[PDB]
Amino acid sequence: TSGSIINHANNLNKVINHVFADKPLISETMLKILTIDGTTGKDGYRNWLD
Amino acid sequence: EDMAKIYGAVAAVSKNVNSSVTYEVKRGTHELIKVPTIPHNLVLIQSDNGK
Numbered sequence A: 001t002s003g004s005i006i007n008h009a010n011n012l013n014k015v016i017n018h019v020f021a022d023k024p025l026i027s028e029t030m031l032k033i034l035t036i037d038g039t040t041g042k043d044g045y046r047n048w049l050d
Numbered sequence B: 001e002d003m004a005k006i007y008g009a010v011a012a013v014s015k016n017v018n019s020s021v022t023y024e025v026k027r028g029t030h031e032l033i034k035v036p037t038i039p040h041n042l043v044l045i046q047s048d049n050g051k
Helices: A003-018 A029-036 A042-049 B004-016
Strands: none
Touching: A003 A042, A003 B004, A029 A042
């Protein structure tokens, strides 16, 4: 349903924004792994959570 | 510290719930003007001698 997809997308962005604010929840070692392809740190963590 | 971040993220999701909507119902409504005089459109024609 379009409602479920919209709800999931908005909630996911709120989590990512809060997680990466101030001191990030995820260490720099995991960011290096998730940014090997070329995607940014925020984007790499976002796909893994999904 | 990392627990406060996880707990903060969950509270952000729970706070995203919508309460209600508010709007004005004005469609179909028009203002009213006031006409002060009644048009009669009458004239009295009388001869000079009054006959």
